[PDB]
């Protein structure tokens, strides 16, 4: 009986005819997502579950006539409307009970208002362009929740990916054109105290001031900062991040292997192909001038004697937004280091390459530092460029050479070329070219 009901949504989804049958297609969408449909007149039909009730013509007014939803329905995109309902259902997958669910949603609304105000304060203090806000701003470019989609804070926009095939952001910044993190309430086994009303009642003109808790209630949930693709993070970052918040980042200690392997998986899996690369940590890179091979050297001992080890993090839980500015600054840092080392990872088949193969390599000297070692471009001794990722957007590099050697490069010229475009497989090219030009 229930399978025949699910059976009819499927054949009603392939049904496509006039407006009457398109209203029956909206009824199909309801039972497809296991929703309940009540229709008053031909014009208004309402899908109702919990507080997730919306009408195409609980505890809150109908918020907005979203152009997004209206445009999709007016045009022939019932599939897009189906995705939007799925997003709404996932947001309210909240367990809780009833009165607790309404309060828990209220807490999310307070957090959203506070985060929005904090973003506004940064714009008032400095009229920064969207790119500056995303790369180095309090919170991040923030899009308020629309329908199912929850608030997205853009932590970082990599220089290579800002450029597509020299994009100027404008206020039209795409939702996925960068690295994005979503803020949401999710149920937890433990019990926590969360603000149930806006906590930025009084705001100090520079930065923000939060009125102290209790209002608040001990709901069995915490605010979350879910990342759409899990970000590989190192053990040292877990300690640096914990120092501020205090909430255990990984709680039940799971697995923790070399970080460089996880960085390769994240980069390789961005574009999926059937054949596994089988890199053996010897990625080959082809560039406009010269050919390079990079050995990532995981398992090199750090000063402690343990190889850099880290575990993918998808959800970070924060009670209030006070520790959020500090947590984001550490993340920004972990993400930037991953991007520079990530730019090298590539799925190429450089086999039997006699010319060039100007191989470069990478050893983990310490958490937050790595050394790329290469033969001197003009002379013969091994030379290297470190890149400690001090901050998300800032890397400091020192090119030590032997006592008798040819001045390979000026640290500033390399920086100018990298900031113009970017990528670190790219940084090694600039070091080689500058040395050769001299």
């Amino acid at each position: 009986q229930h399978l025949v009901s699910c059976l009819e949504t499927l054949q009603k989804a392939l049904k496509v005819t006039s407006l009457p049958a398109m209203t029956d297609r909206l009824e199909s969408i309801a039972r497809q997502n296991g929703l309940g449909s009540h229709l008053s007149a031909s014009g208004t039909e309402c899908y109702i579950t919990s507080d997730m009730f919306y009408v195409e013509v609980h505890h809150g007014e109908n918020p907005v006539s979203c152009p997004e939803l209206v445009q999709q329905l007016r045009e022939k995109n019932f599939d897009e409307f189906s995705k939007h309902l799925k997003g709404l259902v996932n947001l309210y997958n909240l367990p809780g009970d009833n009165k607790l669910k309404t309060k828990m949603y209220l807490a999310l609304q307070s957090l959203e208002q506070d985060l929005s105000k904090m973003a506004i304060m940064y714009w008032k203090a400095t009229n920064a362009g969207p790119l500056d806000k995303i790369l180095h701003g309090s919170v991040g470019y923030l899009t308020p929740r629309s329908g199912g989609h929850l608030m997205n804070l853009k932590y970082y926009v990599s220089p290579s990916d800002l450029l597509d095939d020299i994009i100027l952001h404008e206020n039209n910044v795409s939702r996925s054109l960068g690295m994005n993190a979503s803020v949401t309430i999710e149920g937890t086994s433990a019990v926590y105290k969360l603000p149930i009303a806006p906590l930025i009642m009084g705001s100090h003109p520079v930065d923000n001031k939060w009125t102290p808790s209790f209002n608040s209630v001990d709901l069995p949930a915490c605010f979350f900062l879910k990342f759409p693709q899990p970000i590989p993070v190192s053990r040292a970052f877990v300690q640096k991040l914990q120092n501020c918040t205090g909430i255990p980042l990984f709680e039940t200690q799971p697995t923790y292997a070399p970080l460089y392997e996880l960085i390769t998986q994240f980069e390789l899996s961005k574009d999926p192909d059937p054949i596994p690369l089988n890199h053996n940590m010897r990625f080959y890179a082809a560039l406009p001038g010269q050919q390079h091979c990079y050995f990532l050297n995981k398992d090199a001992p750090l000063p402690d004697g343990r190889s850099l080890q880290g575990t993918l993090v998808s959800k970070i839980t924060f009670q209030h937004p006070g520790r959020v500015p500090l947590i984001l600054n550490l993340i920004r840092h972990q993400v930037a280091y991953n991007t520079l080392i990530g730019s090298c990872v590539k799925r190429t088949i450089l086999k039997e390459d006699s010319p060039g193969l100007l191989q470069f390599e990478v050893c983990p000297l310490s958490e937050s530092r790595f050394s790329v070692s290469f033969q001197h471009p003009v002379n013969d001794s091994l030379v290297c460029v470190v890149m400690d990722v001090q901050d998300s957007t800032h890397v400091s590099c020192k090119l030590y050479k032997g006592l008798s050697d040819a001045l390979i490069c000026t640290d500033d010229f390399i920086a100018k070329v990298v900031q113009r475009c970017m990528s670190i497989p790219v940084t090694m090219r600039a070091i080689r070219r500058k040395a050769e030009t001299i």
Partner: protein, 74 residues
Amino acid sequence: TRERLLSALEDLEVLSRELIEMLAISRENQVLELLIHRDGEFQELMKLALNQGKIHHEMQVLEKEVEKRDSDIQ
């Protein structure tokens, strides 16, 4: 082509009837996929079916004209 259209029509009717009857007995993605595939076949050759008839009427007119011309020539 006529044969293909007739076969598609028969398949569609039987399978749609079977799916509806199973829904009725309870209170079928294989059937659904088959339906949409032959529905595309019928619809794409239904624009053709309409025009074909108009073209056939035009052809009949042309034939009449040719016949007259020949008979006149003879």
